[PDB]
Amino acid sequence: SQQVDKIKASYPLFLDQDYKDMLAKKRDGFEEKYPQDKIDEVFQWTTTKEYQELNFQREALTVNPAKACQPLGAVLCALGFEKTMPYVHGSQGCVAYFRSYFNRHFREPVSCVSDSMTEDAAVFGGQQNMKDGLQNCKATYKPDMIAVSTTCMAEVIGDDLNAFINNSKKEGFIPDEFPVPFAHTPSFVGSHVTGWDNMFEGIARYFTLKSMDDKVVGSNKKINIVPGFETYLGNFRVIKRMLSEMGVGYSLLSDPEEVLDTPADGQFRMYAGGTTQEEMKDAPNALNTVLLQPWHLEKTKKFVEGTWKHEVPKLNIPMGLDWTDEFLMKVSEISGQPIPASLTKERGRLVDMMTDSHTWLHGKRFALWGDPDFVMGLVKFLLELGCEPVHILCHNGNKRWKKAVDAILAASPYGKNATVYIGKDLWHLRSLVFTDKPDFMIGNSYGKFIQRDTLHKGKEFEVPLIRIGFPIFDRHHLHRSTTLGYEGAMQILTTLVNSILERLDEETRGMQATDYNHDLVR
Amino acid sequence: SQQVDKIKASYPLFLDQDYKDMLAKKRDGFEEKYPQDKIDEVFQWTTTKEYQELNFQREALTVNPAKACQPLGAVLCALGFEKTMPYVHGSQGCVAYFRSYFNRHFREPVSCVSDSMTEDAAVFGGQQNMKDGLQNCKATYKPDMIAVSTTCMAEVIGDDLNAFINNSKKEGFIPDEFPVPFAHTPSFVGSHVTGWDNMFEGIARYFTLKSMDDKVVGSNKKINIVPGFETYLGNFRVIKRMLSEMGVGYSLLSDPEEVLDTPADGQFRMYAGGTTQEEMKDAPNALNTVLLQPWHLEKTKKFVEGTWKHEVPKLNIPMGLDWTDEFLMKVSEISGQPIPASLTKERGRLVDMMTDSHTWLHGKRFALWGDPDFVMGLVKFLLELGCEPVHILCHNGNKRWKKAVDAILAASPYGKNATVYIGKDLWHLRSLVFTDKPDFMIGNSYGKFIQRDTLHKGKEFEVPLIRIGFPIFDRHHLHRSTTLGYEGAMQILTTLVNSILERLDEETRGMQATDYNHDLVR
Amino acid sequence: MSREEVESLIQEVLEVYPEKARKDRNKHLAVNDPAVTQSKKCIISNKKSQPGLMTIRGCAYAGSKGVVWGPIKDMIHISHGPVGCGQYSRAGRRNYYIGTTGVNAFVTMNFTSDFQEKDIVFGGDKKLAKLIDEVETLFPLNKGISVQSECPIGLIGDDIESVSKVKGAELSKTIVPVRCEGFRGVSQSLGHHIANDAVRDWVLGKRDEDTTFASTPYDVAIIGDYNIGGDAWSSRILLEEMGLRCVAQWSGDGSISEIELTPKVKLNLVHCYRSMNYISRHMEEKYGIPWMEYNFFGPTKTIESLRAIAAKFDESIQKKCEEVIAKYKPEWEAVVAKYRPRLEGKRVMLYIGGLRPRHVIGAYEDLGMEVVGTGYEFAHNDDYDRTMKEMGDSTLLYDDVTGYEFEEFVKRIKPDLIGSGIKEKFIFQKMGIPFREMHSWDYSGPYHGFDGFAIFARDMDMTLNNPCWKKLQAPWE
Amino acid sequence: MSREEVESLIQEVLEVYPEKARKDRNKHLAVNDPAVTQSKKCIISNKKSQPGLMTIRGCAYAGSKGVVWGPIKDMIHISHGPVGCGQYSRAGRRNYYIGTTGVNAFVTMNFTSDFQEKDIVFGGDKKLAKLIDEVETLFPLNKGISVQSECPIGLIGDDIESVSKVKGAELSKTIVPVRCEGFRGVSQSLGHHIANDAVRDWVLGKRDEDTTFASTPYDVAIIGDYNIGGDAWSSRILLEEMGLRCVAQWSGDGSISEIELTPKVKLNLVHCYRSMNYISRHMEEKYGIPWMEYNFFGPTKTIESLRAIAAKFDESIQKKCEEVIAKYKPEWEAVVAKYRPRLEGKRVMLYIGGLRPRHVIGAYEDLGMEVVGTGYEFAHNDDYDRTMKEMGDSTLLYDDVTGYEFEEFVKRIKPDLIGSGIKEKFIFQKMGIPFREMHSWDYSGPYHGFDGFAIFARDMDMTLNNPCWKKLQAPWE
Ligand code: ICS
Ligand code: CLF
Ligand code: CLF
Ligand SMILES: [Fe+3]
Ligand SMILES: [Fe+3]
């Protein structure tokens, strides 16, 4: 039933007595459900050290992974180029998923096509798909460039992207001059960030490999910036802002910030802004190339150094105070531009915030996850804040990265009770936050289900989630935030300290029980 | 007791069994406390309509006010001028309070002096205090200007500020040409915003009344902006940003954004930035003067119109979509500058966010309080979002303002269940949130105690607080936020929709009970 | 807008396509004539999508794992292959259930074999067996396992059928192999079929010769309701207030025991014909259980359905049918009185999957609204046969519409409201056209039944008449 | 920092002032000589603040309402006057209590008469009487009311004494008039005095004829502990573990009935001498109750205090004293072992109110730290007498320090840590000097007793050694 002036959606409708009774009858009548006491018993067991040890002996089973697949990253990279259509050669199921996954995080349109390879192409290949696909895409969506990746079907059957694209041009399906950079993006190798790197190196190749003869390092007086797989609009913005403030010439290679933030003004814009083909053609003429996320830009790095002859500086992602400082100092060195007064002041304002908030942050324990560069920056900043990054999980991390993070931990007293995990998933992490409970998790939306599980053990075991990462599906507009630079550090500090004070207010809100500490001033 | 590796502060120390038993013994042995059943009974009664009726008959008693006193506003206004020291003629207890009040909200130094009038000066007046005070202040803190207000002692005894200040100059305590603008700021009249208006008019007078003969309206090609009492740094910033983006010459009159945000770089800066004396001197040569918070700038308005001959535009505070549009269009008209593409796109991005979030915002019911202009802007934007601002409280509001707000309500179906209250306090508001329960409160930190009271009735009766206003003492760095313009609307929308979604996640986190609706995607 | 104008809209839009695509797409666009009883004579469907045109369709894995099998709550479903598919489809569909997630229910979890190169080169069957053992250890209360094949599995010649048989016998566990690889078929649709066949071959027969269940003459199964936002619960409650006993729900909030018991029922009540007609036809042929189609969208269709269903039983059921109908009358009437005036005459375009593009038309019409355009991602001609009588004359129909097509149709037709999916939503919002998600119900619902109609009405109104839509043009143009 | 250097620091800083101001401030600044036992001979105190110099001092209302009376939990305290004072002092001091706020306890609420012009012109006495009736209607469980006068009340010739007597007799209720107007005196200090006098005159005598209280040889009252962050609870627990019975706490978490029972105790234990020596002397004179000063900051002082208090009683209490001291020895020793090595040799400057500037020195020393500078806002010469022996030789002493002075002192002395109030905190943080709040305990505490030392130690460490302090200078400067 409904009262027409107070209509109930699923929650709390199904809490009405008649739905409750109905649901009880279904259970008892037809579900052959395990008794509740047995359910409680198994649940408590999954919270144990014993269960954790079995959980960590898994070899074949992954549960609640914290990574996606290559072509996802290839798509996001391609979206950052002017009037460019990402095109995934292979099966169409994939593209519906890529688009939806990004739609949900950005609450924006996400344009991407497939050439709809079916079981027939599985035995004669997808060459015809590529011919008609490229022609159809170009004519229907009028892109100035089509950036081609692959789904795992196309990888397994072995379709030769280069030859198929060359033949499409040869047989007149698209003009010879029409740019169609490509990359093989096998989902069974690495992760979404690997896809990004592969796609980016492929585009750089396409526009520079055969034209190096007339290039001269430094001749355009600019610095190239490669952002990597990046899902916060504020991160593209903060980089350009700081470089502009410095008077530094730069070229941001792969820049989706416009096409992922079009105005609702009565028209749909399929494409907006983005890196130009010219910028890619001319990138070898830069003074140098800075990688914002070096731990998933390895292929790109080899090409930039091997072919462009740039001497890519050894720089961490610019997160936190020390690493933003180093980034700016390196840019200053390369460009001959002093760090302006404005950035120096912003820096001091961040430091001021750290001094204001340090007493609530001190000693706070966190479990966290994400992509390797993001995770290491978050770890770094946490130490800068006097927090303990106790459970550090990077599903797509590697041995070399883990060593690096481990050294950053060792260099601080706050890293003493921290462990870095690679190859582990959120079901591993779930055990850790039960057996060695932190104060909070910093992670993506999948973390909410871990918070749920912890509260079921008890309120005093609940570990609240603080949403920073990708994907964030269950809050609105966090994708507008910033995690890089001083601006990003300020945003993270503010979200951390306030999540702490929120939870304290919750724990002290009980009248005549815990409200002696329900302070007006904190 | 304490375990040295896990030290407990007041919460949760005092929950230890030995403290609990001690507190029980204290209560039983010596406090002569009402039985719990009687406390529970009175509590329930305080939540009733019957109690609400008694509460609304109060004439003499005020309980938990939502305003402060004049000189507080005078101080904040003075702080907005270059190397200016706020100086409150009267008793010193007042200044300790003004300083701390702002310290806690801004987490910044707040510099202000008193001339420490005592019992003796209460019966021969504070002339000697002014002489020595002015001299001591100038010499010790080397300001370029001293801006004088009053505490209620000085007002009740009738000290004549103009005479006292003139006698101080005449007898050589400070140079004749040292600027000492003044304003009487009786605390038993209006509130803190009235203090702001008074101080501002006082300063404008000081620098212009006597040199009006050589002024020509429009000659300097700028627009003056007066911000009023403003405690979000983002609000000064966004105004300046938008006008700079429009290429509009402007003078922001009273600009504390710098001295309320100095860098922690190893030195204390007592003064920073601020509106210059030359800026105030030249102000009558502006094309016009725009009042950002007209409803507490009435006195300023008369002086600007009457003496400067500016025809102050009829503009609401630039909050929300329509009023920001209007602000921008009027500025465009006054200045000759078209609204640039940058602001148009920003406007479009706010509209996009409104479309993205409307389904969770729709019909949400709010109780809210604050200063008149801030409150009416919040009300207007809530209607634009399809929310219902059901309990609208402005302790320091007036009849004319209330009518204005009622007309705003009548112009939207979403204002149909809303009521505006003036002269009422947070104890009145507390009754309304029990008797006619909204979904959330939007208000300052005092509201936390209303959330506490509501929870005590029951979790299903809890009304969560969303912190927007002044003061905010129990969270860190929210004073950096923005509430004006498209930027401010974006922030507000984001905090509202996410507060809604946080609360839904809480209510649906119960395993097997309510978690059927604990969606990953919202 | 007339039939002349729609046929020419179609022609103009098609003018951008290259020769081959133009000729294809032309066959998948039509103007309705409710005369036509053989849709075959005016539109074609269930064909391959043209490359590069941005179809909105998914794959057979979406159809099997995301749609049919995923909702079964007390089984563990393995996304077998690389990490993508399982992660993009993790908890995106709101197939609601009651359970203790991670302990006795697993619906929102993502279990996966996370294929690496060594698995592609040497096969994943050994990994799968090991994965099964690890599942049994860490999730002891699971009541069966399904293996949902992603693209690589068949391509590389793995044999999940054999792994399932072998491990099933070793552990005395129901392990269902599903060859739902996304390269198969042309859309989600073949995934349903494949998944229906899997249920039949590996689960449905389990209690064929088992008589312990105490049956009644009033036993029914709800077939093809995935309980989106609780849709099946708000359907179930009505059937049971009518005196029926709902033995099974396929598969929203469904249990493996419910599935196994379904062959004991007296009547299969089919909501989603597209996804589960296959198994329904099977149960009729093998157990002699008849099945009928019904519709619980809006009061008109719900009332009609309760009546049709009751007629299959006896006078005591037909009597309670009228008692339920009388009970809810004032409720849905107050909903109509409140919201119809706010929606009357408004025009809607729909694009959804294989059922709702026709099935919701009645509910829109109970609020005075007009569906001036509809279409399906993956429907077959028997769906279009059912559609052309539900749609008005000279309305626009589109099969496997392209992103280009849908945008251009909307620009010309200018509907007051569009109901479609997540990949469409943000496009139309920018164009200033109110948009409701008609897969996910935009995180609202249920929409099924009398109780769902209230939410449905509230939702269409809140969005269609929202203040935000008058604000898209800056007053300085 | 030698004695000669400190003296030069003082003269140099004074160089900025006009003649009159320098002559005054020179009398309020001194270099410690712990030999000197008549503080009078080295420093002046408890005089007016010089105008315009940015004293840190509060007013008499702060001392009466904010400090002494406000904490009493089951009374309602009226800030009588304009809206400012009651609002700035609302919930700013962490005088903790147990109660149901708004029902039986009222500490963090702001009740005010919100004087308007008509009250200034015509007097507020009728408003007060009306206000009292409204209070009694809406807050029936209050057990008494205090009327805390703001600046205008006396200046306009109101008679709150008469309103209180009349209304008190009418309602049979304790109504306490307090003439604590902020123009009175020079600081918070006269506020304490006025406040003690009002307790004596209007509350403390109420049970003089009452013999129903069941007294014991071990009854004590805690006098002058306002339970900041729970300080009084973590003191109380020790006294009762020692076998004493704590009849009253003045006034943290204090009740009116406890105040009324205090004349029945055997011994008044005075922590804050400055704020409550007045009532303690009166109680000795009138009821023959002895009073003694104590100190529960840090293990050394707390052990010495327990022992001196126990010695006033019998052998059974002195035995329990030693059992308490043995119980907590390992706990505070573990705190010292962990934290002293992190803090040893560190130099602290303090500036606080009337007690803590001397009382906390022993706790700092128990962590190997050195207090190189201290001062008070509003202490009297008997406080400075107690201070000169606690402070090391050649240390700096400052009475009613000016903002300029404090800043210049710190710049030259460069302490590792500064402990002062909210108005000071953000200044010194910008200078890169670790700061701890020593009124509010920086939202932490308790600091009293053994349990308090552990928190104090944690706190001085977390702040002094925080990583943020090495990051203030950008690497390119
Ligand atoms: S199963 Fe089918 S696409 Fe019948 S694949 Fe799809 S939860 Fe749609 S129109 Mo998403 S044939 Fe169900 C459907 Fe309809 S996932 Fe849901 S909304 S009624
Ligand atoms: S059509 Fe369908 S969704 Fe596509 S793969 Fe095939 S079953 Fe799966 Fe998962 S891992 Fe990524 S998304 Fe693909 S490329 Fe390999
Ligand atoms: S020294 Fe002390 S705090 Fe000052 S007034 Fe006097 S008792 Fe009070 Fe409240 S209202 Fe405002 S702050 Fe003053 S000016 Fe009138
Ligand atoms: Fe959007
Ligand atoms: Fe600060």
Using a CB–CB cut-off of 8 Å, the residues of C that contact B are 90-92, 94, 96-101, 108, 230, 426, 429-430, 440, 442-444, 459, 462-463, 466-469, 471-472, 474-476
Structure tokens at C192: 């349903």
SS3 A114: strand
Can you state the angle between helices A426-435 and A447-457, rounded to 10 degrees? 30
CA–CA distance, A255 with A233 (Å, rounded to integer): 10
Q: Is B455 on the interface with C (CB under 8 A)?
A: no
Query: Going by C-beta distance under 8 Å and a sequence separation of 6 or more, which residues neighbour residue B506?
Result: none
Structure tokens at C448: 């099924």
Q: Which residue has the tokens 């690997």?
A: A194
Tell me which residue has its CA closest to atom 15 in ligand 2. A152
Q: Which residue has the tokens 């027969």?
A: C205
Residue A305, CA distances (Å) to A220, A311, A401, B220, B374 in order: 17, 6, 21, 55, 56
In a domain, A24, yes or no: no
CA–CA distance, A333 with A326 (Å, rounded to integer): 10
Task: Name chain C contacts of B517, Cβ cutoff 8 Å.
Answer: 96
CA–CA distance, B302 with B292 (Å, rounded to integer): 15
Among residues D94, D192, D193, D274, the one annotated as catalytic is D192
CA–CA distance, A168 with A159 (Å, rounded to integer): 14
CB pairs under 8 A between A and C: 321
Among residues A152, A238, A312, A331, the one annotated as catalytic is A152
* Core vs surface per residue D268-282: b (16+ CB within 10 A) or e: bbbbbbbbbbbbbeb
Residues A464 and A381 in one domain: yes
Query: Going by C-beta distance under 8 Å and a sequence separation of 6 or more, which residues neighbour residue D180?
Result: D60, D61, D63, D64, D65, D148, D149, D191, D194, D195
Query: Going by C-beta distance under 8 Å and a sequence separation of 6 or more, which residues neighbour residue A416?
Result: A388, A409
Whether the Cβ atoms of residue B290 and residue B333 lie closer than 8 Å to each other: no
Residues B405 and B356 in one domain: no
Nearest CA to A383 out of A418, A344, A433 is that of A418
How do D145-149 and D175-178 pair as beta strands?
parallel
| Topology adopted by domain C60-202 | Rossmann fold (3.40.50)
Count other Cβ atoms within 10 Å, centred on residue D15: 7
* Core vs surface per residue D161-199: b (16+ CB within 10 A) or e: eebbeebbeeeebbbbbbbbbbbbbbbbbbbbbbbbbbb
> Which residues, in sequence order, are bridge partners of residue D245?
D219
Beta sheet of D76-80, edge-to-edge order: B62-63, D111-112, D76-80, D145-149, D175-178
Beta sheet of B440-443, edge-to-edge order: B419-422, B388-394, B365-369, B440-443, B465-467
Tally the residues of chain C.
477
Q: Identify the CATH homologous superfamily for domain D1-59+342-476.
A: Nitrogenase molybdenum iron protein domain (3.40.50.1980)
Residue B481, CA distances (Å) to A205, A218, B81, B322 in order: 44, 41, 22, 21
CA–CA distance, C291 with C283 (Å, rounded to integer): 9
**Sign, CA torsion A126/A128/A129/A130:** positive
Strand residues in A48-144 grouped as ranges (E): 62-63, 84-89, 113-114
Task: Parse chain D into domains and list their residue ranges.
Answer: 1-59+342-476, 60-202, 203-317
String of DSSP letters for B394-452:
ETT--HHHHHHHHHHHHTSGGGTT-EEEES--HHHHHHHHHHT--SEEEE-GGGHHHHH
Residues B496 and B359 in one domain: yes
Atom of ligand 3 nearest to the CA of D59: 2
Residues A359 and A389 in one domain: no
Tell me which residue has its CA closest to atom 13 in ligand 3. B94
User: Is it true that the peptide bond before D446 is cis, omega within 30 degrees of 0?
Assistant: yes
CA–CA distance, C361 with C349 (Å, rounded to integer): 10
CA–CA distance, A261 with C288 (Å, rounded to integer): 57
Structure tokens at D70: 């406000």
Residue C389, CA distances (Å) to A51, B246, D23 in order: 58, 57, 103
> Which residues, in sequence order, are bridge partners of residue A81?
A275
Write out the H or E segment, with its range, that includes residue C347.
strand C347-350
Q: Which of residues 322-381 of B touch C (CB under 8 A)?
A: 322, 325, 328-329, 332, 338-339, 344, 347-348, 351-352, 354-356, 358-360, 362-363
CATH code (residue B371): 3.40.50.1980
Inter-chain residue contact D116 with B189, CB threshold 8 Å: yes
Atom of ligand 3 nearest to the CA of B151: 14
Whether the Cβ atoms of residue D281 and residue D356 lie closer than 8 Å to each other: no
Residues A304 and A335 in one domain: no
CA–CA distance, B212 with B196 (Å, rounded to integer): 24
Q: Which of residues 379-418 of B touch D (CB under 8 A)?
A: none
CA–CA distance, C70 with C425 (Å, rounded to integer): 24
Ligand 2 center from residue A146 Cα (angstroms): 21
CA–CA distance, A62 with B139 (Å, rounded to integer): 72
Structure tokens at A236: 């593209």
CA–CA distance, B294 with B301 (Å, rounded to integer): 8
Site from D13, D151, D241 to mutate, B interface, most B CB atoms within 10 angstroms:
D151
Residue A423, CA distances (Å) to A67, A369, A393, A427, C308 in order: 10, 12, 8, 12, 56
Nearest Cβ partner for C18 among A136, A188, A268: A136
Site from D107, D183, D332 to mutate, B interface, most B CB atoms within 10 angstroms:
D183
Inter-chain residue contact B517 with C96, CB threshold 8 Å: yes
Per-residue H/E/C for A465-516: EEECCCCCCCCCCHHHCCCCHHHHHHHHHHHHHHHHHHHHHHHCCCCCCCHH
User: Nearest 5°: phi and psi at D48?
Assistant: -55, 150
The alpha carbon of residue C130 and the mean position of all alpha carbons in its chain are separated, in whole angstroms, by: 33
Ligand 2 center from residue C67 Cα (angstroms): 15
> What percent helix, strand, coil does chain D show, rounded to 5?
45, 15, 40
Alpha helices in C35-103 (DSSP H): 60-61, 84-88
In the residue annotation, D214 being an active-site residue is answered as no
Ligand 2 and A112: CB distance under 6 A: no
Nearest CA to B381 out of B432, B320, B332 is that of B320
Ligand 3 and B74: CB distance under 6 A: no
SS3 D310: helix
**Chains touching C (3+ CB pairs < 8 Å):** A, B
Structure tokens at D306: 């327990």
How do B62-63 and D111-112 pair as beta strands?
antiparallel
Q: What is the DSSP letter of C402?
A: B
Q: Residue type at A45?
A: W
Cα–Cα–Cα angle for A506, A490, A492, rounded to 5 degrees: 50
Closest Cα in chain B, distance from residue A94 (Å):
19
Whether the Cβ atoms of residue D446 and residue D233 lie closer than 8 Å to each other: yes
Atom of ligand 2 nearest to the CA of A151: 14
Among residues D25, D80, D93, D94, the one annotated as catalytic is D93
Among residues B95, B112, B137, B152, the one annotated as catalytic is B152
Q: Residue type at D44?
A: I
Given A166, A193, A214, the domain boundary residue is: A214
In the residue annotation, D448 being an active-site residue is answered as no
How do D219-225 and D145-149 pair as beta strands?
unpaired
Nearest CA to C146 out of C254, C276, C270 is that of C254
Q: Candidates C189, C190, C355: which one to mutate for ligand 1, based on the most atoms within 8 Å of Cβ?
A: C355
Tell me which residue has its CA closest to atom 16 in ligand 1. C439
Inter-chain residue contact B133 with D51, CB threshold 8 Å: yes
Write out the H or E segment, with its range, that includes residue D8.
helix D3-14
How were these coordinates obtained?
A: X-ray
Domain that holds residue B368: 364-469
Alpha helices in C52-124 (DSSP H): 60-61, 84-88, 117-122
Ligand 2 and C364: CB distance under 6 A: no
In a domain, B301, yes or no: yes
CA–CA distance, B48 with B39 (Å, rounded to integer): 15
Structure tokens at D241: 């573990």
Ligand nearest B262 Cα, by number? 5
Count other Cβ atoms within 10 Å, centred on residue C340: 15
Residues A133 and A108 in one domain: yes
User: Nearest 5°: phi and psi at D280?
Assistant: -65, -40
Site from C468, C470, C472, C477 to mutate, B interface, most B CB atoms within 10 angstroms:
C468
Whether the Cβ atoms of residue A426 and residue A447 lie closer than 8 Å to each other: yes
Residue A17, CA distances (Å) to A7, A13, A14, A24, C26 in order: 16, 10, 8, 10, 53
Q: What is the resolution of this structure in A?
A: 2.0
Closest Cα in chain A, distance from residue D218 (Å):
28
Count other Cβ atoms within 10 Å, centred on residue C35: 10
| Greatest Cα-to-Cα distance within chain B, rounded to the nearest angstrom | 82
Whether the Cβ atoms of residue A362 and residue D466 lie closer than 8 Å to each other: yes
Query: Going by C-beta distance under 8 Å and a sequence separation of 6 or more, which residues neighbour residue A234?
Result: A480, A481, A482, A483, A484, A487, A488, A491
**Sign, CA torsion D405/D407/D412/D417:** positive
Ligand 2 center from residue C85 Cα (angstroms): 5
Count other Cβ atoms within 10 Å, centred on residue A309: 12
User: Nearest 5°: phi and psi at D46?
Assistant: 60, 40
Q: Is A37 on the interface with B (CB under 8 A)?
A: no
Whether the Cβ atoms of residue B480 and residue B372 lie closer than 8 Å to each other: no
SS3 A48: coil
CA–CA distance, C50 with C24 (Å, rounded to integer): 8
How do B145-150 and B84-89 pair as beta strands?
parallel
Closest Cα in chain D, distance from residue B449 (Å):
9
Residues B331 and B310 in one domain: no
Q: Residue type at A521?
A: V
CA–CA distance, D13 with B227 (Å, rounded to integer): 38
SS3 B21: helix
Closest Cα in chain A, distance from residue B386 (Å):
16
The CA radius of gyration of chain B, in Å to the nearest whole number, is: 25
Q: Which residue has the tokens 């500064």?
A: D418
Closest Cα in chain C, distance from residue B444 (Å):
28
CA–CA distance, D336 with D366 (Å, rounded to integer): 7
**In terms of CA atoms, which chain C residue is nearest residue A173?**
C18
Q: Which residue has the tokens 């327990």?
A: D306
Q: Which residue has the tokens 């590796």?
A: B5
Report the domain count for chain B.
Answer: 4
Question: Known catalytic residues of C?
Answer: 59, 62, 93, 192
CA–CA distance, D110 with D86 (Å, rounded to integer): 6
Whether the Cβ atoms of residue A296 and residue A193 lie closer than 8 Å to each other: yes
In a domain, A296, yes or no: yes
Atom of ligand 3 nearest to the CA of D151: 6
How do A62-63 and C111-112 pair as beta strands?
antiparallel
At the second CATH level, the architecture of C203-317 is: 3-Layer(aba) Sandwich (3.40)
SS3 B140: helix
Task: Name chain C contacts of B352, Cβ cutoff 8 Å.
Answer: 429-430
Query: Going by C-beta distance under 8 Å and a sequence separation of 6 or more, which residues neighbour residue D440?
Result: A521, D93, D94, D228, D229, D421, D422
